Structures are given as C-alpha cells and as structure tokens.
Scaffold this active site. Structure first.
Site, PDB file in Angstrom:
ATOM      1  N   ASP C  38     -26.148  19.661  17.614  1.00  0.00           N
ATOM      2  CA  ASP C  38     -25.072  18.765  18.054  1.00  0.00           C
ATOM      3  C   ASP C  38     -23.780  19.491  18.453  1.00  0.00           C
ATOM      4  O   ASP C  38     -22.844  18.852  18.921  1.00  0.00           O
ATOM      5  CB  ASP C  38     -24.757  17.717  16.966  1.00  0.00           C
ATOM      6  CG  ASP C  38     -24.359  18.349  15.616  1.00  0.00           C
ATOM      7  OD1 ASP C  38     -24.997  19.356  15.205  1.00  0.00           O
ATOM      8  OD2 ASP C  38     -23.427  17.819  14.956  1.00  0.00           O
ATOM      9  N   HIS C 243     -25.189  45.814  31.885  1.00  0.00           N
ATOM     10  CA  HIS C 243     -24.700  44.618  31.176  1.00  0.00           C
ATOM     11  C   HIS C 243     -25.140  44.658  29.712  1.00  0.00           C
ATOM     12  O   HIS C 243     -25.825  43.763  29.221  1.00  0.00           O
ATOM     13  CB  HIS C 243     -25.143  43.316  31.874  1.00  0.00           C
ATOM     14  CG  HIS C 243     -24.599  43.163  33.264  1.00  0.00           C
ATOM     15  ND1 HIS C 243     -25.363  43.375  34.393  1.00  0.00           N
ATOM     16  CD2 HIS C 243     -23.360  42.834  33.705  1.00  0.00           C
ATOM     17  CE1 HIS C 243     -24.619  43.176  35.467  1.00  0.00           C
ATOM     18  NE2 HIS C 243     -23.400  42.846  35.077  1.00  0.00           N
ATOM     19  N   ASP C 260     -16.122  47.122  29.627  1.00  0.00           N
ATOM     20  CA  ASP C 260     -15.933  46.223  30.759  1.00  0.00           C
ATOM     21  C   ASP C 260     -15.566  44.861  30.183  1.00  0.00           C
ATOM     22  O   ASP C 260     -16.378  44.213  29.537  1.00  0.00           O
ATOM     23  CB  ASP C 260     -17.211  46.149  31.613  1.00  0.00           C
ATOM     24  CG  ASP C 260     -16.978  45.534  33.002  1.00  0.00           C
ATOM     25  OD1 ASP C 260     -15.945  44.855  33.219  1.00  0.00           O
ATOM     26  OD2 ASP C 260     -17.832  45.733  33.900  1.00  0.00           O
ATOM     27  N   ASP C 271     -11.051  41.571  35.562  1.00  0.00           N
ATOM     28  CA  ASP C 271     -12.310  42.313  35.475  1.00  0.00           C
ATOM     29  C   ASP C 271     -12.019  43.815  35.560  1.00  0.00           C
ATOM     30  O   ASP C 271     -11.912  44.377  36.636  1.00  0.00           O
ATOM     31  CB  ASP C 271     -13.239  41.829  36.591  1.00  0.00           C
ATOM     32  CG  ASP C 271     -14.601  42.494  36.592  1.00  0.00           C
ATOM     33  OD1 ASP C 271     -14.997  43.284  35.696  1.00  0.00           O
ATOM     34  OD2 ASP C 271     -15.315  42.210  37.557  1.00  0.00           O
ATOM     35  N   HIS C 350     -25.565  49.901  41.635  1.00  0.00           N
ATOM     36  CA  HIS C 350     -24.904  48.631  41.924  1.00  0.00           C
ATOM     37  C   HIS C 350     -23.885  48.772  43.056  1.00  0.00           C
ATOM     38  O   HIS C 350     -23.636  49.861  43.544  1.00  0.00           O
ATOM     39  CB  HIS C 350     -24.266  48.037  40.665  1.00  0.00           C
ATOM     40  CG  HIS C 350     -23.230  48.909  40.025  1.00  0.00           C
ATOM     41  ND1 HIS C 350     -21.932  48.988  40.487  1.00  0.00           N
ATOM     42  CD2 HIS C 350     -23.287  49.702  38.927  1.00  0.00           C
ATOM     43  CE1 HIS C 350     -21.243  49.812  39.716  1.00  0.00           C
ATOM     44  NE2 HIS C 350     -22.039  50.252  38.756  1.00  0.00           N
ATOM     45  N   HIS C 354     -17.069  43.495  44.389  1.00  0.00           N
ATOM     46  CA  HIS C 354     -17.385  42.079  44.567  1.00  0.00           C
ATOM     47  C   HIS C 354     -16.082  41.290  44.646  1.00  0.00           C
ATOM     48  O   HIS C 354     -15.041  41.749  44.177  1.00  0.00           O
ATOM     49  CB  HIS C 354     -18.279  41.549  43.430  1.00  0.00           C
ATOM     50  CG  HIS C 354     -17.680  41.693  42.066  1.00  0.00           C
ATOM     51  ND1 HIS C 354     -16.748  40.811  41.556  1.00  0.00           N
ATOM     52  CD2 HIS C 354     -17.884  42.626  41.106  1.00  0.00           C
ATOM     53  CE1 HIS C 354     -16.395  41.212  40.345  1.00  0.00           C
ATOM     54  NE2 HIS C 354     -17.077  42.303  40.048  1.00  0.00           N
ATOM     55  N   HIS C 361     -17.710  36.963  39.622  1.00  0.00           N
ATOM     56  CA  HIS C 361     -18.414  37.267  40.870  1.00  0.00           C
ATOM     57  C   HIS C 361     -18.142  36.088  41.768  1.00  0.00           C
ATOM     58  O   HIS C 361     -18.867  35.089  41.743  1.00  0.00           O
ATOM     59  CB  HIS C 361     -19.915  37.465  40.652  1.00  0.00           C
ATOM     60  CG  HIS C 361     -20.238  38.661  39.813  1.00  0.00           C
ATOM     61  ND1 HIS C 361     -21.408  38.777  39.096  1.00  0.00           N
ATOM     62  CD2 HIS C 361     -19.518  39.775  39.538  1.00  0.00           C
ATOM     63  CE1 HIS C 361     -21.407  39.925  38.438  1.00  0.00           C
ATOM     64  NE2 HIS C 361     -20.273  40.550  38.692  1.00  0.00           N
ATOM     65  N   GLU C 383     -15.338  49.385  41.723  1.00  0.00           N
ATOM     66  CA  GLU C 383     -15.968  49.838  40.485  1.00  0.00           C
ATOM     67  C   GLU C 383     -17.064  50.864  40.674  1.00  0.00           C
ATOM     68  O   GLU C 383     -18.237  50.599  40.397  1.00  0.00           O
ATOM     69  CB  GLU C 383     -16.497  48.663  39.676  1.00  0.00           C
ATOM     70  CG  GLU C 383     -17.435  47.727  40.376  1.00  0.00           C
ATOM     71  CD  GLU C 383     -17.664  46.485  39.522  1.00  0.00           C
ATOM     72  OE1 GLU C 383     -17.897  46.612  38.289  1.00  0.00           O
ATOM     73  OE2 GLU C 383     -17.578  45.384  40.078  1.00  0.00           O
ATOM     74  N   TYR C 387     -24.360  56.785  36.102  1.00  0.00           N
ATOM     75  CA  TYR C 387     -25.118  56.552  34.884  1.00  0.00           C
ATOM     76  C   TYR C 387     -26.298  57.508  34.909  1.00  0.00           C
ATOM     77  O   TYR C 387     -27.161  57.443  35.796  1.00  0.00           O
ATOM     78  CB  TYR C 387     -25.559  55.091  34.798  1.00  0.00           C
ATOM     79  CG  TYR C 387     -24.465  54.140  35.208  1.00  0.00           C
ATOM     80  CD1 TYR C 387     -24.363  53.710  36.530  1.00  0.00           C
ATOM     81  CD2 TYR C 387     -23.501  53.706  34.295  1.00  0.00           C
ATOM     82  CE1 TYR C 387     -23.347  52.856  36.938  1.00  0.00           C
ATOM     83  CE2 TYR C 387     -22.476  52.831  34.696  1.00  0.00           C
ATOM     84  CZ  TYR C 387     -22.413  52.418  36.019  1.00  0.00           C
ATOM     85  OH  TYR C 387     -21.425  51.574  36.453  1.00  0.00           O
ATOM     86  N   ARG C 404     -18.002  54.180  34.161  1.00  0.00           N
ATOM     87  CA  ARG C 404     -17.528  53.294  35.219  1.00  0.00           C
ATOM     88  C   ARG C 404     -16.019  53.117  35.051  1.00  0.00           C
ATOM     89  O   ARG C 404     -15.507  53.096  33.933  1.00  0.00           O
ATOM     90  CB  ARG C 404     -18.269  51.949  35.181  1.00  0.00           C
ATOM     91  CG  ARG C 404     -17.787  50.936  36.213  1.00  0.00           C
ATOM     92  CD  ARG C 404     -18.729  49.751  36.411  1.00  0.00           C
ATOM     93  NE  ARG C 404     -18.814  48.831  35.269  1.00  0.00           N
ATOM     94  CZ  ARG C 404     -19.828  48.760  34.394  1.00  0.00           C
ATOM     95  NH1 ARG C 404     -20.886  49.558  34.482  1.00  0.00           N
ATOM     96  NH2 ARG C 404     -19.799  47.862  33.421  1.00  0.00           N
ATOM     97  N   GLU C 406     -13.129  50.604  36.875  1.00  0.00           N
ATOM     98  CA  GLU C 406     -13.018  49.421  37.719  1.00  0.00           C
ATOM     99  C   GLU C 406     -11.601  48.880  37.702  1.00  0.00           C
ATOM    100  O   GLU C 406     -11.044  48.640  36.625  1.00  0.00           O
ATOM    101  CB  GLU C 406     -14.006  48.355  37.233  1.00  0.00           C
ATOM    102  CG  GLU C 406     -13.763  46.969  37.780  1.00  0.00           C
ATOM    103  CD  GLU C 406     -14.876  45.992  37.426  1.00  0.00           C
ATOM    104  OE1 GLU C 406     -15.436  46.060  36.299  1.00  0.00           O
ATOM    105  OE2 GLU C 406     -15.185  45.153  38.296  1.00  0.00           O
TER     106      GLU C 406
HETATM  107 MG   LIG Z   1     -16.495  44.514  35.313  1.00  0.00          MG
HETATM  108 ZN   LIG Z   2     -16.728  43.673  38.356  1.00  0.00          ZN
END
Ligand SMILES: [Mg+2]
Ligand SMILES: [Zn+2]
Ligand SMILES: [Cl-]
Ligand SMILES: [Cl-]
Ligand SMILES: [Cl-]
Ligand SMILES: [Cl-]
Ligand SMILES: [Mg+2]
Ligand SMILES: [Mg+2]
Ligand SMILES: [Mg+2]
Ligand SMILES: [Mg+2]
Ligand SMILES: [Mg+2]
Ligand SMILES: [Zn+2]
Ligand SMILES: [Zn+2]
Ligand SMILES: [Zn+2]
Lengths: 440, 439, 440, 439
Positions: C38, C243, C260, C271, C350, C354, C361, C383, C387, C404, C406
């Site tokens: 619930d 991710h 991130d 971001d 990647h 974006h 995104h 970004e 890796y 990374r 960004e």
């Molecule tokens: Mg990011």
């Molecule tokens: Zn991003």
C-alpha cells in the site's frame, strides 16, 4: 451479376485520391468467429475490406501507400500457402497468386506483419486506420508505431497523424455504382422469389420455422448461401415483436404471419418484409390495418426522389397512419393535435427507412433526424408498419396485430426504382397467389 | 425427443455432489457474436451452460452454492424483463418466471451481478470457475475476488482456492444418459434422412451448394434449424480437402461427391458422411477405393464395444487399408513393414473416431493416442476415409479420389448401437436408391 | 529561481499557436506508483504536464481547446476537495482555487472526466494526444471517442484526426528560456556543492553509500529534496560499471571513486560526474588516464558553440583518446587506422553528450548519429570517460580504472556557459581541496 | 544484524510443508518502476519474494515443486549474465552462481520462462499463485496453463486447482523469528538515533525538509539507505494532516513539529513518531494535550501482552483520551456517554496499532475490528495521537495542535519488548535533550 476486377481497382484509387501525400491506409480483414468450442461460424468478411478486395479470407491486411499525388502502390498481407493446413482447412490464395488475382503490387505473409509493417510506415506523415474496429488490428498498428517512435537510433520515425478512414469510405459506400446496383437488383429478385415461395407454401399447422426453411432453400438455389440477417417469421402476437427470430410457434388459422427476410448475394443485402394471412384470407380487421400500412408504402414509393429526405417522407406517412387509426377508433381526437403529440408512436416505433448495401443497416451519414437530402445512387428501404399489442387499449378486434411491408429502392435521376416489386403486396394479389398455389 | 426439467436438476445435483463444502460453482452463458457491423449470428449457447439449464439467452450466469454435505442452492443471474428491449429484440424470461421455469432457488438481474456476486462468494473456501473460457466472465470473477480480498475492513474474505470445473463436467458429458441417447438417436435419424435426400436429388450440372440446400431444408423441416458444423459438399478433387466448405463447384458426371453434414437437434450433434457417384453409378476405380473404406467401417462397427479403445480399433483399420492399397498397387512392399512405417498416412491422415454430443467434437479425455478403454454410454463417430491427391504418385485412375463414410455409435453394455444406419452405405444400395429416385 | 505564472501561460499559448483550429490538446498527469504493498514512491509529475502547469498532483488532465486562430481556452480536470481524504492524504487544490492558481479558464472534477470529456471533444476536427504514454489516459480518450463515434443519433461526432503532440512539445523543451536557464544554473550550483562536499568528506574505510548520504543531504539542504536519477558511487572496479548504483563496497586506500549524481531542482536536472582518489593522492597510473579524460572535457568545452554538433565534437574527443591510449601502450598501432576501426570503443562505449532539462536524458531530436546543428538555448552534458576492465589485455597498472568527468553546459550566442564549473576538476585542485578538508 | 542462508531455507521448507503433494508454488519478483521517462526509481523487491530469497533483482521467479511428502526441489528463473548489459546496468547473479548463492537446486534464464514453466507445471494437481498481484506474472502463468490445457495431443495436462499462497505466507510473516526480531531491533535503534538527531538539530527558521534531511542522513550512515515510507515532518497546523509529506514550510518558534519517520534495514521497517516543540520548550497548552497522548502510549505499553488484542487496548486508550479531553473542556458531558458515542473520533481518527515487518503496514489477519488475540512473535506499532483542527469548536489554545507518539513493540511470552525506547518521549527529557544540544 458481380463486381469486376476493374471496379475493385477504381475503389482503391478513389480512396488514394482522397489521401494526403506521404501516407498509408490500413484495412484489416474480419477475424474468425467461434460458434462453440473448436467450431466456427461460416466466415463473413469485414464489409470495408470486402469493398476494396472481394477477398474472403481472414488474417489479411490491405495497405495502400501514397508517396505523392502521382505515385502510389498497394501491399497485401495474407496467409501463406501451407500444404498441411490447406489439406485440412481449405485452399489459400498465398503470396505468388495474390498480385494477379487481387490486383495488388506486392503480397507478403501475414506471419511477417510485425516484422514488415513498421518498415512500410517508417517516415510517413499520416496513417489511416479505423481505430477500435478490431482488437487484433489495434495491437498490430500500435506495436508498429511504438517500434518507430522508439527507433530514432535506428533512423526510424513514426507518422504523428492518425486519421480514421471510415467517414470517407462510408461516404463512398453510400453512393452505389451501376455494377453495385446490378448486384442489388439480383439480390432483390432472389429475395422476392423467396417471399413468393413462402406465401405459396404456407398452411395452418406448419411452424414458423418451416417458412424460414423454404426461404433459405430459395436463397440457396440462386447462389445466395447465407441470409443477410436472421430471418423473422412472426405469426399472430409474435408479429408485434420487431426482431422476433425464435420462429418456434405453430401457425394458426386466423392469424397473420410477418416475414422479414433477405439474402446476401455477392456481399450485398436484400431486405424484404411481407405480411399475409396464414389461411389465405384477410379478415376485415386485418384488412383495415393492412390498408393503412400499404397506403403508407405506396405513397412513400411515389414520393422518394432526389431533393427530399427520409424525415420529410416520414411526415407524410405519419399523417396517413394517424388519419387511418382515427377512422378505426384506435386513436381518438384531432388529427393535427395527435400528430403534434406523436400519438402514432405506440403503434409505429421504428424508422421508415435505412440505407442498404454491404450491410443490411448500411453505412453513411443520415443527418439529424434523417434529414439528409437524397441524391441518385443512394439505396434504402421503405418499411412502414403498425403493431397493436395484445393488451393495447383499443377496439378488441385489432389487438395482437403486427403488419409491416418493406421494399428496397434506389434513388434515380427522376425518382426511384423499386428492386423488390416482383413479390406481390396488394391484398387481392396476395390472396390470388395463395389460392393458385393451393390448387397445385 | 427432449431433455426434461428433472434431468437438468439431476445434472446440477451430480455436480454439487462432487463439490467441496463451502463452495460455489459459476457457469457463464456464451456472449453474443457479431457477424457484420450491428448484425449478429444466430445465438449458440455455451454447451456447459446449456447442459445444466437448457436456457438459450446470453447475459446469464448459473451459480450453484454448496454450504455443506446436505445444504445447497442455486442462483441465476439473467436479463431483466424490459418492455422496450423485448418489443424490439424478443421476449426475455426475467426474474419472476425463472425459478419455476429453470428450477433455480433465486433469480437476480444480470445488471446487478457486480453488486451481488461478491456477496455470494464471501466467506467460501472454494470457487469453481472455468478460467480463460470467456473474457467477460474472467473480468466479473476477478472483480468479485478483488473486492473480497481488499474488503477485510468490511469483514469480507475471498475463497483462496479456485478450481476449474471443466474436467469434472466434461467427464459427466462423456457418459450419456438414456434421455440424451434418445435425443442423439433422433439427431441421427434427421441427419440420415437429409443424406438420403441429397443422394436422391443429386444430378450432374447442379452445384455443390444445391445439395447443401437440400440437406439444410431437411434438417429444418424436422425442427433442427441449424447444422452442428459447416456442411461439406466436396465433389471430384474437392473430396480430398478434409474441411472443404466453399461448396462452389459444378458437380460433374463421373465424379464422386463427399457429403459431411450433421444437424443440431436440442443442442446435440449428428455427424454423418456419405460418398457417392454424382451420376448414380460407381466406376471400377471408385468402387475399388470405396470397398476398402467400407470394409474399414463395417469391421470397426463389429469391433467397437466396452473394453476396447479407439487406438486398438484403429490398428485393425490400418491393416485393412494398407492391405487394400497394396492389392491396388497404390502402396508397394510388405504389408507388415508398410504398417510399421505408417505408409497409409498420406492417404488417411485423420483419426478414426471422435466423441460426439453437445459439440460435434465432443469433450472428454481420450487418453494418450486415444487409448482410453471404452465404456457403456460413450458416443463416438466412426469415420475411415481414403484421400488420394490429384498429383499423387499412384496409378492414374485413383488420383483425385476422396472417400469417407462416417456413422455415429453409442457404446452399450455388450457392444454398440449404430444411430445413423438408416442412410444406406453399401454401393449396390446407393446405386439402387439413386436409380429409383431418377424414375 | 523559479518558473513564473506568466511563463506557464506563455508555454500553453506557444502550443496553441501551433494547433489547428477546431482542435483540443490533452495532457495527462503521471499516475501514482507503488513501492511496496500500500506504500507509494514520492510522487513525480509527468515532465510534459509539469512543463505546462507546475502542478504536482496525480489524477489531473489539462485540456487546451482552440476554436479558431483568435479564440482558445483551457479546462483542467483535477481531484475534488474532500475533507476526509485530505486529513489523511494531504491537501488538494480543488476546483474553486484552480483557475486563479494555475491560470486555467475552467476546472472540473476528475471523477466526472468520462461524463465531460466527450462533450469537449464533440464536433472538433483534431485531437492532440500522446497515445501509448499512459494506459489510464488511453482508456479515457478511447472511451470518449467511441461515445462520439457511436452517438450520431444524439448529434455527436468524433474528431477523425489524432495527432501526437510529443514531437512539437519536445522541440519546445529542447530550447530553454532565460527563466529555465536560471533554474538550471541553480541546479548546477547545488549539484556542484554536493560533489565538493563528497570530495571533502571522503576517507578510506567509508562505504560508497556514505558519500551518497553526504550528497543527498547537500541536495536537501538547498531545497532539492530528490535526486534527478539514482546516485552512482563506484570505487575501484565498480567505476567500470556505467550505471553502478549498489554503492555497497568499502572504499579502499589506493582506489579511485567515481561519483555521478545530480539534484532535481524545480523539476530540472543537474548531472555531474567527478572521479577522485579515495586517499587524496592520484597515482601516476591514475593520473595518466585522468589527464586524457580531462583534456577531452576541456577541449569539448572550448569547442561547443552554435554551428557545431555532438558528432563533430565527438570526433575530436576520439582523436584525443586514441592518441593518449597509444602513448600509454593501451592501444597499439597507427592513430588514424585505430580511429578508423573505432579502437577506443572497448574503453569509451557511451555518447559524449545528451540533452538535459526536466529529464536528465532530456527530450528532443538528436539527428542521425547526434549530428544535429547546435543552437543557442540547448542544454547538454559533456561526459568523456575511459573504463579499463580488470581483465583487459593492457599494461597491468591500468587495469580496473574507471574515470568519467561530466559538466553541464548551455549553448549561447558566441559559445557556451558551463553551469557546473564551481566543483573542481584539475587533479592538483582536487588534491588541494582534499588536503584542506583533512586539516579541518 | 542479518538474515542467514539457513533462515531463507527454513522459510522455503515451512511453505513446502504446507503445500499439497504434486504441487508447485510460484513467487514472482517486483517489476522495475518508472520515475520519469527512461529513469527508474531505486528498486524495491516484492516483500514475499524477498522473504524466501533475499534476492534484489527484477525478472526473477522462484518455483518450489513438491512431488510428495518427502521429495521437493526449487527452480529459480533469473536474468542471464550479459557482458554488455552489466557493464551498463550493473552486475547480475546469473545461472551458474545462483544455486550456491541462493540455495536453489536449479537456475534457468528468465528469457526462457515461457518455454520452460509449462514443462514444470505439467501433470501437477495444484499450482500456488498470487493471482492479481502483478500483471506480468498473471500473463506468464495464464499462458503456461493455456498451453497445458490445449496440449492434450502432446500429452500435456494442466493443474485444475489454483490456490492463493498469500494467506499462508502472510500468516508466516506475522510471526517473527529470532533472526527477524534482531534485524527489527537494529531498525528500531537506527530509527531512534535519527529522531534524536532531528530533535537536537531543530531550530526555528529551518524548513521542515531540513529535518527530513538530517533523518535520512542518519539512516544512511548506519547502512539503511532508504526510508520504509515517505517521511512526515508536520510543524504547526501541518501536524493535523496524518500523511503530510510536502515538508515545505518554515518551522516557527511556538509550534510543535510532528515527525513520523522510519528506516528500511535489510528489508525491515522502523516506524517511529515523535512530537516536540520547535523552540525546545512545551507551552502549557501543548503539554496538556501531549500528556494525554503520552499516558495513552505508556498505558498501552503496560497492557500489550499475549491474550489481549488491539481492540481491547484501544478501549482503554479511548477512556484515557475522552477523560483527558473532558478535563480540558475540549469535550463536554459524561465520560461514559461520550465514549458510547465515540466522541473522541474527530480528534483520533486512526487505529492505535498496525502490524510491522517487511512492510510498514505489515501483512497478517487482524480479525474483525482488530480483535485478534495477540501471541508471542507478533510485531506491532503503538501510536496514539490527538489532532485538533485549526477551526475546531474548542478553546483557542488547543486549535491547530497535532500530536502523535509512536513506538514499535514485539509481543513476548509474558508481555512485550519496546524496540524504539532509546529515543526519549517524556516531555522533561525532550526539553533536556534539546537544551543540551543547543549548548
Ligand atoms: Mg551523469
Ligand atoms: Zn549525463
Ligand atoms: Cl501466414
Ligand atoms: Cl439485466
Ligand atoms: Cl475527483
Ligand atoms: Cl534472461
Ligand atoms: Mg427488414
Ligand atoms: Mg463428419
Ligand atoms: Mg479420375
Ligand atoms: Mg509512523
Ligand atoms: Mg495555537
Ligand atoms: Zn429493413
Ligand atoms: Zn466426425
Ligand atoms: Zn505506524
């Protein structure tokens, strides 16, 4: 008579002419329909799909693609030829024979539709689709569009505009071509012959379903295997039930029998109603009501022509009915006041006319209160009736009488042509027909 | 014949006897079915709903409630009486008349089913429901169970157990009562009369559909308004297509015509196939194949009895077929080896027998390879056939021949009774029938 | 900063300007979303519904009706004020307050939508609806249209044309107004402060989730209660998982940690990604890879401006990466040949950039391979990352490194503005920040 | 604390022990849940699936098969190991590692479930399935059963009986094991520390959401990353809204703040409410209402034990509330008559107690009016409150006051144990805590 290959092609091109450039129209076949467990009803093609193809298989989709004002082509999805499936469940056209047979540019297997339809829709501006017609079609179309919407990385784009083609197509179907009128003329003739036979065969002690049997046998012998709707054979008090289809009662000496029956011939519907005495002789009371219904029909047949409307002709019929019922003592009061309060409604509760074509209650806009102005090529029924309930508070001799007389007409340049006049409707002609048959 | 009020009551009680205490069984009517646009096909009730009620309306639900081993009752949901709706679309039984007419304890309006069904299921342990049979039914049942599950604050509880009643009911339907056998006997007689009529009316130059017309007229005149399945009239090469229903060809002198047609009489199916020459005289080639199919049928009719099975009788038929086909040069080699490699299959690709009843292909467990032991009261077809394709690599005179002969039987304490023997099948009797009609 | 009432009104009018006359646009709120049994997740409004309303309730529908080129009006369906429901589940705007609060002409109860929507759609030519977005919305719209289609006897007619508004609205959202840029500027600042805090708090022996905790606390204290996406804190080999959100490992002396994280502030996403040494000191190997990623970012930031594209800038980054990796002995061969065979792909899999906005995104057409020409008002991320898998066949000291970096930028008239430059990215500045915090 | 491998195994066997022989139980993972566009909320496993596995992935199904009283085994469907998918969206357990990790006999790829599930159900008598829980699960189960029902020619048969396992499983979850009580004890401690922190940090001029921030940071630092429900921080008139979660107002000197917040630790929920003055000192009016709520809680904590019920303890609380409200002039009249007409309801409109566990409002049958007799191992909240609306027709000093005090308890053999007593609730202790923090 039949519809030519060239006619199916003209119809497709008439639709494409109305389509926006950079568009596709999707027309889906009817699904098969379960009768009980694993057994299915005899297949009836979707009327719009039939109109553009004359193709009587399920699991088929016609796709008409318009690139621009001069360039267009057609793709058919249909069932593949499968040796085993066909040995069992009958022959299939398949992909190789379809282009020539049906006049389409390309034919693909229905089993590949989800892999192929989105490729045909990719990059178009408009898709024409009858949303909500069939669940299976909506699933196919929505899946294609979602693949395109989500496929931007694969350089796919969905048409943002969806238009229902039904209004356009139904306006096309409303106006019959000479070929269609020739088919309807034959349907009217076959249906009339069936009604004549029923009148000639009728005897007290037969069941209502026996007349249904005679009618269906007559349809069949002329190549119309299926009725266009469920046959109504309502004798005595059953005649007061508008869509009585049980047909389960023994027909009694002294009763009328109301028969509403029509064949389906090359997809097109006949739709005739005759009412007559089971014993071949109208009583005074039956004759009194019959004459009102007949005058209404005969007057309507004189009146129907371009420039009038169903609404307008209905007004004249209402006057005839109210006037008649007042003279019999069924209604009481001033005619104009009775008309003003729609006092005929308890005895005549349905419309005078509906469109007729590939469906018995055919497609096409009627206008508010069926006020649309009639034009040549429209095909419609004319079906006045009076139904006096067994418990109605009227003079006792009228109770339990149901009479309807229905003909099918086409509007012409100067008037109309009656497609079903070959079965008699004057009471003396009905009686003479029955006497002659009883000699047988 | 007919099924009585008392019989419908006996069937309901036989189901209730098999139900757990604190349970309800839900049996739903068939939905109406669109033919085109606003027009519908003639209504055909769900066979299971029909079996317990004999009630031919849609929007109806029979609910049988068993409180305990001695206490049970029935509730019917059905369409209300509505003056306007009935003046238009025919009479309805309604709530007042239903208890007496259908022998139910209580009748309620179908429009109230979502307000009332959950109240009947509340606090029961078991619900018997044929899940997946109809979408509209599943929606109603699932909505009721959800209300109950979510209604604990309103002191509601759902039955945690759902049982499919179809196995139990289909086992009931597999064994016919004397009243049902009397109805099936009449269905077989009506169907036989129609096949006799078709043989007597057949002439070269008529279309296949004309014989379909004669057949349906005959069904109708005996009160069987609808066929139990789509009529097959396959002349010439169309006889090789098992479910040929187009019936669109002109029948030609020199061809055989295969007719598979059956009436539906009080819900029960006839199912007869006869094959005969369009011109009234079998050729030598036609007779050679016909005789193999007829021997198969006649032998099967001798063998079928309690204690054997469809599988066992099929084995004998296969030997008859292979032996016969070898004699004609249609198959080549040793009979036993041919049988071992199922060399008949190209020519006889369907089963010898199926159950018959309220459905033409009736309900009931067959066992693996139709090996179930037969017992008295089972009703089944016997339908050997041989179908030689137009392009088959066999002697020319046999190509394009399709022959099936099908009778309906009931298993008795000691053997079987043939319900469809009143239409002829011996080739000399067929010819004599046709000659007499043509005088 | 925030979006003004006047801005929401401008947006609605910009949509109406693009609509055909005799049409209605339907914009539905997001449904509530179950977390367990619930209990529900904190509510997140549909981004398109938010864009036109700033209204954070479920069970609401905005209907914009355009009668003609000069006449238009708005109708809101929303939940009624209910004393009991509100005492329990919080206050509701209701119908009386909605017109003034949200600037709509008329407000109706959502419970009446099925009785009212078809009346609004009756007689229109076009309906704009995002088909397939939400099942509950599709049911409502399809029911309305079927009532109209079937209601010809009640003088009802359905719009035959349905158009997806998403392409138009998403093109609007792609170009940010000055008010939106001011909000994004604040989101970037809040997000930068959170990353700075994480760097200052980080110690070996803490778990990855401890840094997530610091970040979220910092978002919250500036009034950004929720992250715009699930926070990633990947230390050591976890940094190679793009991710990674488990954040469950103890952070070890000698490892890098990749963070991130971004806030959602007034609906708009920050971001930012920063990578830094857990122990405050980059090793030579870590520094060697970091420098390549940083050069890629710094070069991109110099290059991004109107008239270029993501694709074009990506080509320059690829050259930087391949060249760098060749000097380290991670790749072997001729740079131009390696570039031609996309030899960087195993290490940078990647995209470089974006769109960014109400969704992290964000919506808007990228063009094939993200080749769309950039224009002022577009907001995007930059970004680059490298890796190197733990099992990669490269010199051993590079294995298991994920880096990374960004930033978020807005394209301006002459170049770009970096919205996230207030958190450091040069290795010496990172080290100095951490030293200073460890004093404290 | 944590739940061990052996415990998950014991739970599975306890379910299997209650299953009929020739049956399978199907337990489905929660689907992933969209937050906005392509972004998803942090994953929350289905509580029942979690209870039997401790496995935090979607697209997984646990199948427990009982052949007979001695033979049973388990099959897991879960996501396959995919190099690309995992580099992007995190590591997956896969099929090779699952048997050892999760203690299942067999693991199969979820992508194969429609090709394999029907094979596992074939020939069983009973399937245990929570119908209606998830749409994706119902589709999978219904497809499997349809294949079986229609597959008689392939020698397939469907189980005719479907049983909802939720009543059995929820009865299991209602009684906590010692390992679960150890986890709940830790959840209560973590939650208590967060409430203490909020009281120590609170200052006038801060916003409600700042206290939410302090609370979540404290949950997180002890390894409880997510709250078990949306945190309520209702200051002033917001305290009268039971599920106020906007937390958007500036906290004002002179107001109370009501904080209802709980961590989720190893799947288990804490659930604590404390109300305290924003400025660290209760006014006389605030203290007058607070004391009634506190007396209600303290009395309830004395009374709760095996053999009583939530309904029975509620009756005592209602007397305390009505008596107290009469003394303050908030209610007027005779206490017994006021109690008889439930005159407290405008001010205390929710229940005193709910079950607590893997869900904050945990599973388990309460009985009519929560009259079920308590037994050792049940875990529940105790949360009296009084909410006086801003426009209530009562003395002005009481309008707009919302107070709730909530503790979590476990019923023991002789009484109860309070899992949340480590955050203070006596008004003098609250004030002393806040004074000390402000030095
Ligand atoms: Mg990011
Ligand atoms: Zn991003
Ligand atoms: Cl196909
Ligand atoms: Cl009803
Ligand atoms: Cl509402
Ligand atoms: Cl998988
Ligand atoms: Mg008619
Ligand atoms: Mg047959
Ligand atoms: Mg031949
Ligand atoms: Mg609480
Ligand atoms: Mg006050
Ligand atoms: Zn008509
Ligand atoms: Zn048969
Ligand atoms: Zn609680």
């Amino acid at each position: 008579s039949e519809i030519s290959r060239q006619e199916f092609q003209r119809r497709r091109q008439a639709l494409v002419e109305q389509m926006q450039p950079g568009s596709a129209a999707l027309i889906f076949a009817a699904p098969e329909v379960t009768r009980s467990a694993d057994s299915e009803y005899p297949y009836r093609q979707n009327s719009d799909f039939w109109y553009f193809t004359g193709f009587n298989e399920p699991e088929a989709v016609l796709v008409l693609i318009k690139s621009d004002d001069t360039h267009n082509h057609s793709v058919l999805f249909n069932r593949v030829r499968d040796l085993t499936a066909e040995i069992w469940f009958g022959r299939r056209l398949g992909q190789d024979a379809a282009p020539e047979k049906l006049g389409v540019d390309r034919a693909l297997a229905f089993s590949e539709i989800n892999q192929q339809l989105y490729q045909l829709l990719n990059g178009l501006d408009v898709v024409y689709h009858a949303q909500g017609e069939y669940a299976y079609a909506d699933v196919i179309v929505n899946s294609a569009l979602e693949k395109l919407r989500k496929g931007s990385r694969q350089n796919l784009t969905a048409p943002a505009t969806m238009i229902d083609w039904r209004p356009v197509v139904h306006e096309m179907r409303l106006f019959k071509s000479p070929e269609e009128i020739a088919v309807l003329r034959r349907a009217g003739e076959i249906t009339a012959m069936a009604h004549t036979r029923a009148m000639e065969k009728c005897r007290p002690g037969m069941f209502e379903y026996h007349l249904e049997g005679e009618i269906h046998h007559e349809f069949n012998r002329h190549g119309a295997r299926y009725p266009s709707y469920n046959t109504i054979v309502g004798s005595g008090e059953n005649g007061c039930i508008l869509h009585y289809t049980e047909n389960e009662c023994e027909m009694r000496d002294g009763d009328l029998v109301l028969i509403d029956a029509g064949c389906e011939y090359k997809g097109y519907a006949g739709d005739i109603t005759r009412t007559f005495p089971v014993n071949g002789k109208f009583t005074q009371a039956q004759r009194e009501i019959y004459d009102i219904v007949l005058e209404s029909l005969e007057t309507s047949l004189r009146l129907y022509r371009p420039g009038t409307s169903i609404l307008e002709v209905t007004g004249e019929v209402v006057r005839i009915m109210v006037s008649g019922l007042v003279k019999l003592g069924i209604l009481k009061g001033d005619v104009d006041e009775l008309i003003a309060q729609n006092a005929h409604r308890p005895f005549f509760m349905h419309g005078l006319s509906h469109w007729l074509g590939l469906d018995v209650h055919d497609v096409g806009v009627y206008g508010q209160d069926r006020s649309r102005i009639l034009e040549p090529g429209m095909v419609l029924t004319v079906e006045p009736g009076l139904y006096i309930a067994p418990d109605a508070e009227v003079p006792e001799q009228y109770r339990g009488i149901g009479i309807r007389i229905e003909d099918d007409i086409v509007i012409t340049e100067t008037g109309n042509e009656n497609l079903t006049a070959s079965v008699v409707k004057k009471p003396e002609e009905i009686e003479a027909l029955m006497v002659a048959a009883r000699k047988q």
